[PDB]
């Protein structure tokens, strides 16, 4: 559980040195562009219900074998757990986007996720497809691109934060 500021002091502690002015230049930039970081976290959590619905429904549409008997999203109980997993993964991504660091995502959610899915028989390749759809859905909302829903906001540059969202989603796919 580390934010952007804690990451700076953790690295500098390993050499037992005070946080220098040069290292503080990264933090002053982080604070200056903090309000842009609050444009975006508000955007994802406002549309969390729609994003997970697109991911899971689109994932099944491309792999019709999941709803056939023996598939891992067949009954109602399995379908409800798949939707609940999509929400938890998205919830922890919006934690890292707010904090500015991936520590919260890595240590509380993706720790041991690969082993659990192996024991349960969850398909690993289909879990990647679900998250990759969530990654494209979230990025579209960050840059205010989604065709049906548009959130009124002042013009600006979104490259730094949208790229960060893609990096957090790739960590999930790479771990599982």
């Amino acid at each position: 559980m580390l934010d952007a500021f804690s990451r700076v002091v953790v690295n500098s502690d390993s050499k037992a040195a005070y946080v220098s002015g040069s290292d503080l230049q990264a933090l002053k930039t982080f604070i200056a562009d903090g309000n842009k970081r609050l444009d975006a976290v508000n955007s994802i959590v406002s549309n969390a219900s729609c994003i997970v619905s697109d991911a899971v429904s689109g994932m099944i549409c491309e792999n019709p074998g999941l709803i056939a008997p023996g598939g891992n999203c067949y009954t109602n109980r399995r379908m409800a757990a798949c939707l609940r997993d999509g929400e938890i993964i998205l919830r922890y991504t919006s934690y890292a986007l707010l904090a500015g660091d991936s520590s919260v995502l890595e240590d509380r959610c993706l720790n041991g996720l690969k082993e659990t899915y192996i024991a349960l028989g969850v398909p690993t390749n289909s879990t990647v497809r679900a998250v990759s759809i969530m990654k494209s859905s979230a990025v579209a909302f960050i840059s205010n691109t989604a065709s049906q829903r548009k959130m009124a906001t002042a013009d600006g540059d979104c490259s730094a934060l949208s790229s960060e969202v893609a990096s957090y989603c790739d960590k999930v796919s790479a771990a599982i």
């Binding site: 559980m1 934010d3 002091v9 976290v41 959590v45 934690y95 707010l98």
Partner: protein
């Protein structure tokens, strides 16, 4: 580490909630105050050698009995260790200003100090006397801004209350 961001997120995580207006408003507080705190940390980083030497001398002038044989600080090796321990505390105060909370201080000195100082027989008054001297000597505006010095004295008062 305790901070405005981590405490806010951890409360949301416990209840399984997305970050909402309550959570984003707390982070807005860090943005406003980051200007004042960051000035103090950048000031102490460039002048840590003078603060440590001045604080360390005040400890031994007030308590000359630490020099006598059989006490802590009875030798040259033990004397230089005293200044090294003050440097660590002034380093973590500098970390507590950058982080924005008391994270590093609780995690790295206050966590188990009370047991350690008892085993090695190091009086807690000696460390208290060093910080009291630094806290009272800092003055505005020649040292730092009016608001930056408020944040600095907040960090010194926290460690002092921990040792007694």
């Amino acid at each position: 580490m305790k901070s405005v961001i981590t405490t806010t997120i951890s409360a949301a995580d416990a209840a399984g909630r997305f970050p909402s207006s309550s959570d984003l408003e707390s982070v807005q507080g860090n943005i406003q105050r980051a200007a004042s705190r960051l000035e103090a940390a950048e000031k102490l980083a460039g002048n840590h050698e003078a603060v440590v030497k001045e604080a360390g001398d005040a400890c031994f002038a007030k308590y000359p009995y630490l020099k006598n044989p059989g006490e802590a600080g009875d030798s040259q090796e033990k004397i230089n260790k005293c200044y090294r321990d003050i440097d660590h505390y002034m380093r973590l105060i500098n970390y507590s200003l950058v982080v924005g909370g008391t994270g590093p201080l609780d995690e790295w000195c206050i966590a188990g100090a009370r047991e350690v100082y008892r085993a090695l027989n190091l009086p807690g008054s000696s460390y208290i006397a060093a910080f009291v001297f630094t806290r009272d000597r800092l003055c505005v505006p020649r040292d730092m801004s009016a608001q930056a010095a408020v944040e600095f004295s907040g960090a010194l008062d926290y460690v002092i209350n921990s040792l007694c």
